[PDB]
Design a binder for this molecule. Structure first.
Ligand SMILES: *[C@@H]1O[C@H](CO)[C@@H](O[C@@H]2O[C@H](CO)[C@@H](O)[C@H](O)[C@H]2NC(C)=O)[C@H](O)[C@H]1NC(C)=O
Ligand SMILES: *[C@@H]1O[C@H](CO)[C@@H](O[C@@H]2O[C@H](CO)[C@@H](O)[C@H](O)[C@H]2NC(C)=O)[C@H](O)[C@H]1NC(C)=O
Ligand SMILES: *[C@@H]1O[C@H](CO)[C@@H](O[C@@H]2O[C@H](CO)[C@@H](O)[C@H](O)[C@H]2NC(C)=O)[C@H](O)[C@H]1NC(C)=O
Ligand SMILES: *[C@@H]1O[C@H](CO)[C@@H](O[C@@H]2O[C@H](CO)[C@@H](O)[C@H](O)[C@H]2NC(C)=O)[C@H](O)[C@H]1NC(C)=O
Ligand SMILES: *[C@@H]1O[C@H](CO)[C@@H](O[C@@H]2O[C@H](CO)[C@@H](O)[C@H](O)[C@H]2NC(C)=O)[C@H](O)[C@H]1NC(C)=O
Ligand code: NAG
Ligand code: NAG
Ligand code: NAG
Ligand code: NAG
Ligand code: NAG
Ligand code: NAG
Ligand code: NAG
Ligand code: NAG
Ligand code: NAG
Ligand code: NAG
Ligand code: NAG
Ligand code: NAG
Ligand code: NAG
Lengths: 171, 195, 344, 98, 47
């Protein structure tokens, strides 16, 4: 009826009064419409949806990349499918091979998963928290040191930043 | 000398990037016909060039405002960092700290300051125990129906004999009446031993 | 409704004289809780999708304001990585995952309500489970598929309303199970090694002798502990029971306010898409239809300016809130090193 | 996309956010009501007697296609101005309470 | 009693100056023909 737009049209359950033609949501966008020939109500849903991130090892080393689709669950709305599809609680990762080891985080993907440029290709793994250890606790056992080490460590702290001034008229 | 001071370089990088972003934002039209005042003032006469100049003025004013706001926020963070550095200077360099992990990892012995571009570096000298050894231990010693507790140490045993040592360095000594003190009898302490 | 003058507290008087002293004859072992916020939600914004939508005319008009969106996203990513850094300073103090032995002989002290429960899918404690159910998040997971809200489910589910306008929430780097593992390692180290695992290698020591050391640290001789060990263990167990009780009963307001504030900020962003900002309408499709390019550009310019300043306000207030959360996380890290890894 | 949003030809190791996943429209559809008649262009513009301005006439128009190109041969207007709408958009729209 | 609390007076001064700056900023045209609503609403018609 002259109102233009873009989106996906689906059958609706809303039911208009006879003096109504369009339906609006809280952001005041038209989200429902009555078809002027069949008199049926339709819902209008937008077309773009879902975040995308790109994981690179740096283009000074390679132009291989992996892509994380943060709203897809494959078990699609993807640009490519390639190989090495790996599902994560942060989304579907495409272009990186899943391994069973665990290292320190290199590139944080999220939800406990990191990625790195190892063997060349891109691998994705679950980050390790640290080495496992156990204390030999008993009710009558103690451990006493017999030597020592003198350690020297550095700690860096910022104290100032640059002082600037601006001339409004000149800018 | 080998290979960094990333936390001190990020400050310089951030300030430089902010100024350069200000400079490149002079290429925005903000909804005017051009971003150059000399293309507007030539080809347009005062009353109808004023609308375009007003658009440019509003845009550039809000650019300056954004810069100043983000500078204030960053200055608050640097202020917090400088307050922490002053506290560390008074408590780790001008004294000896009992606060855990405040002046390094280990038991703090001393600290030395060094100046760096826009910041400070602390060299923390700490004491780290090493080469520990297992011993059998006991809370108290029972001698004459009396319980003896160590004064400033702990009771250990090399397997057959009992000594009293200091907690942070193995230096065994014979249990005497100058190492211990008496309190009560031998019926209340749980893991008391005879010696 | 009544109105009164508030009272400062009960009045008290000390029986001060020049040769009188008061000495305690008994004690109590008290256990208290302290709650501290450490992170907030990490968000990201797509300018083009928020300001224009699928409008190509608007997106071409917006190319005079690309520096402003790169700036907004730079600020938001700074906040987002700062949140993970916060969590790491608080919880990742030690890099050895200590386990507690099956020797649950701690001199009579019962640590069963704060030690991991292997009967759960996670390995969270009893108290950690009670805490987990008193804070209601807004995102149960972070995978909401397109097909899942397709129809009128959008604009009735607030999260799909946010997502259709370019507002994304990213998941934290450390899962909740990893944080539970970290706290479990801290507890195991502190009950089997005292304060030595925070200064070097963990050196075992019986728990009663460690408690005697800690009694020495406050000016009480060790025989006071060794002669009252059962009473002290019972008081500790009762105090821990009181905690669980109180909790499971009835709050974590300081942790719920963070979630509430972030959700309210995002929803305010979404409703501010109904403002005209001085244009003829707030819909780009009512302007682009019924108006031709050169004279629709004025209206689209008004809308663009308004929505840009909306995004700017959001980002500024997020930066201010992130500074406050950063201060809170620094305090929590200091408390972790000085109260948990030592005696203050 | 990242090279271009960074305004640089080199990208450093890491992970970067890009634009949301876009889908392009495949078709174009138009849905107007079932209207067959043409509007009374010849009894409004070609009438034989008009009203006095103090007692001006008001007429209701409904249920007709507004194809004004038929006025190109028999009519020439010295003033034509619309408010609230563009003249180049009048052929795509649909009008209420005319 | 002789002669200060500058750090406590600066807070009062800053708050007062902020409010007064708000009040004087009501004299800006912001690109309009005047800064008074009554000069615009009289001599000009609604649209
Ligand atoms: C305590 O540790 C030090 C090392 O820090 C030991 O000294 C080293 O002894 C070895 C073997 O005799 C030498 O090769 C090194 O040169 C020594 N180091 C230094 C810095 O001199 C020392 O022997 C240890 N003490 C005990 C009692 O074990
Ligand atoms: C525990 O330490 C004592 C040291 O007092 C050891 O006993 C002495 O050992 C030396 C050398 O073997 C002998 O000369 C002494 O006669 C021993 N007795 C005394 C009273 O000095 C004892 O061997 C050590 N036990 C273990 C298991 O190492
Ligand atoms: C310590 O001795 C003082 C002195 O009698 C006691 O305090 C007084 O108590 C009475 C009754 O409660 C009050 O009316 C007085 O005002 C108190 N202060 C004085 C007289 O200076 C106190 O109860 C004693 N404390 C203990 C623990 O026994
Ligand atoms: C110190 O206080 C404790 C209470 O905290 C006293 O122990 C209580 O004694 C009463 C009466 O004998 C019992 O009903 C309670 O069950 C005891 N409490 C616990 C936790 O066991 C203790 O007697 C006091 N000591 C002194 C010397 O007064
Ligand atoms: C608009 O015209 C269409 C046809 O051009 C009508 O569609 C008919 O609808 C009836 C339902 O009662 C069907 O039995 C016919 O098969 C339809 N025709 C076609 C060609 O599909 C429609 O009814 C008209 N609008 C109204 C309000 O009557
Ligand atoms: C295909 C698939 O992943 N199915 C799993 C299902 O096995 C599991 O029980 C459930 C738990 O919520 O999550 C989903
Ligand atoms: C026995 C005990 O309680 N703790 C350890 C044990 O786990 C380990 O296998 C052994 C060899 O290092 O050393 C001891
Ligand atoms: C020499 C001596 O004291 N022997 C006693 C013994 O008489 C008593 O039966 C036992 C249990 O208390 O403890 C020991
Ligand atoms: C009280 C509680 O919460 N848990 C258990 C309880 O179920 C059990 O009966 C008791 C003895 O096994 O130990 C404790
Ligand atoms: C006087 C005159 O020219 N009348 C016109 C005629 O020429 C034309 O054929 C007809 C159809 O357009 O409309 C009328
Ligand atoms: C990346 O390229 C630049 C220029 O080619 C070079 O100076 C730099 O060293 C390279 N990076 C590394 C890590 O070598
Ligand atoms: C993917 O789908 C499966 C089952 O349909 C579900 O269990 C899983 O949670 C989904 N992905 C994630 C990581 O949520
Ligand atoms: C990796 O871990 C999986 C977990 O089931 C296991 O099946 C597999 O053998 C391991 N090795 C691989 C697949 O690289
Ligand atoms: C202490 O004894 C236990 C028990 O066998 C053992 O695990 C551990 O290696 C010993 N520690 C040292 C430092 O000898
Ligand atoms: C220590 O535990 C053992 C069990 O192996 C027990 O026989 C002994 O009485 C306990 N001693 C103390 C002091 O707890
Ligand atoms: C310690 O000595 C006393 C008195 O000689 C004795 O009664 C008691 O049984 C002894 N304890 C042990 C464990 O031998
Ligand atoms: C510790 O307390 C719990 C009650 O919550 C009880 O189930 C358990 O048996 C106690 N442990 C011991 C060793 O008594
Ligand atoms: C108006 O009159 C002219 C001349 O008679 C004719 O060309 C035209 O078709 C008429 N208009 C209508 C609507 O009949």
């Amino acid at each position: 009826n002259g109102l233009t737009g873009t989106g996906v049209l689906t059958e609706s359950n809303k039911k208009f009064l006879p003096f109504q033609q369009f339906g609006r949501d809280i952001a005041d966008t038209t989200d429902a419409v009555r078809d002027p020939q069949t008199l049926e109500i339709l819902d209008i849903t937008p077309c773009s949806f879902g975040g995308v991130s790109v994981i690179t090892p740096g283009t000074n080393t390679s132009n291989q990349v992996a892509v994380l689709y943060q709203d897809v669950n494959c078990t699609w709305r993807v640009y490519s499918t390639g190989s090495n599809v790996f599902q994560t609680r942060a989304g579907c990762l495409i272009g990186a091979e899943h391994v069973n080891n665990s290292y320190e985080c290199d590139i944080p993907i999220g939800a406990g998963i990191c990625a790195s440029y190892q063997t060349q290709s891109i691998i994705a793994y679950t980050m390790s928290l640290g080495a496992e250890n156990s204390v030999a606790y008993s009710n009558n056992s103690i451990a006493i040191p017999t030597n020592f080490t003198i350690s020297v460590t550095t700690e860096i702290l910022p104290v100032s930043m640059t002082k600037t001034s601006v001339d409004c008229t000149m800018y | 000398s080998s290979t960094a001071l990333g936390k001190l370089q990020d400050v310089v990088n951030q300030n430089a990037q902010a100024l350069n972003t200000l400079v490149k934002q002079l290429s925005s039209n903000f909804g005017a016909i051009s971003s150059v005042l000399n293309d507007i003032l030539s080809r347009l006469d005062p009353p109808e060039a004023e609308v375009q100049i007003d658009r440019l003025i509003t845009g550039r004013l809000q650019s300056l405002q954004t810069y100043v706001t983000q500078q204030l926020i960053r200055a608050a963070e640097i202020r917090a960092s400088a307050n922490l550095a002053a506290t560390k200077m008074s408590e780790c360099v001008l004294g000896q700290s009992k606060r855990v992990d405040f002046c390094g990892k280990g038991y703090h012995l001393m600290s030395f300051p060094q100046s760096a571009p826009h910041g400070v570096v602390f060299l923390h000298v700490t004491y780290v125990p090493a080469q520990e050894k297992n011993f059998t231990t006991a809370p108290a010693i029972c001698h004459d129906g009396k319980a003896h507790f160590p004064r400033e140490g702990v009771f250990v045993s090399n397997g057959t004999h009992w000594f009293v040592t200091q907690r942070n360095f193995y230096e065994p000594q014979i249990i005497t009446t100058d190492n211990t003190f008496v309190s009560g009898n031998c019926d209340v302490v749980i893991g008391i031993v005879n010696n | 409704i009544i109105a009164y003058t508030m009272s400062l507290g009960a009045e008290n008087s000390v029986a001060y004289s020049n040769n009188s002293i008061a000495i305690p004859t008994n004690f109590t072992i008290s256990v208290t809780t302290e709650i501290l916020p450490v992170s907030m939600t990490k968000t990201s914004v797509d300018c083009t999708m928020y300001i224009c939508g699928d409008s190509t005319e608007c997106s071409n008009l917006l190319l005079q304001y690309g520096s402003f969106c790169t700036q907004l996203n730079r600020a938001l990513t700074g906040i987002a990585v700062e949140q993970d850094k916060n969590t790491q300073e608080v919880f990742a103090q030690v890099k050895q995952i200590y386990k507690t032995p099956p020797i649950k002989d701690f001199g009579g002290f019962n640590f069963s309500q704060i030690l991991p429960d292997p009967s759960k899918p996670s390995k969270r404690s009893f108290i950690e489970d009670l805490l987990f159910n008193k804070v209601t998040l807004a995102d149960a997971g972070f995978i909401k598929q397109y097909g899942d809200c397709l129809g009128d489910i959008a604009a009735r589910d607030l999260i799909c309303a946010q997502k259709f306008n370019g507002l994304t929430v990213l998941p934290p780097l450390l899962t909740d199970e990893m944080i539970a593992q970290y706290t479990s390692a801290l507890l195991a180290g502190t009950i089997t090694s005292g304060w030595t695992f925070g200064a070097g290698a963990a050196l075992q020591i019986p728990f009663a002798m460690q408690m005697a050391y800690r009694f020495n640290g406050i000016g009480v001789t060790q025989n006071v502990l060794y002669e009252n060990q059962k009473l002290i263990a019972n008081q500790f167990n009762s105090a821990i029971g009181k905690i669980q009780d109180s909790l499971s009963s009835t709050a974590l307001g300081k942790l719920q306010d963070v979630v509430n504030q972030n959700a309210q900020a995002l929803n305010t962003l979404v409703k501010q898409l109904s403002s005209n900002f001085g244009a003829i309408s707030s819909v780009l499709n009512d302007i682009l239809s019924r108006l031709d390019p050169p004279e629709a550009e004025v209206q689209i310019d008004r809308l663009i300016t308004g929505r840009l300043q909306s995004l700017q306000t959001y980002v500024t207030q997020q930066l201010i809130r992130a500074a406050e959360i950063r201060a809170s996380a620094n305090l929590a890290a200091t408390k972790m090193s000085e109260c948990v890894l030592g005696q203050s | 996309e990242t090279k271009c949003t960074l305004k640089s030809f080199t990208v450093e190791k890491g992970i970067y956010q890009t634009s949301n996943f876009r889908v392009q429209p495949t078709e174009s559809i138009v849905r107007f009501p079932n209207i067959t008649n043409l509007c009374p262009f010849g009894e409004v513009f070609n009438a034989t007697r008009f009203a006095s301005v103090y007692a001006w006439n008001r007429k209701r128009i409904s249920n007709c296609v507004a194809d004004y190109s038929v006025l190109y041969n028999s009519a020439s207007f010295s003033t034509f101005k619309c408010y609230g709408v563009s003249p180049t958009k009048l052929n795509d729209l649909c009008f209420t309470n005319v």
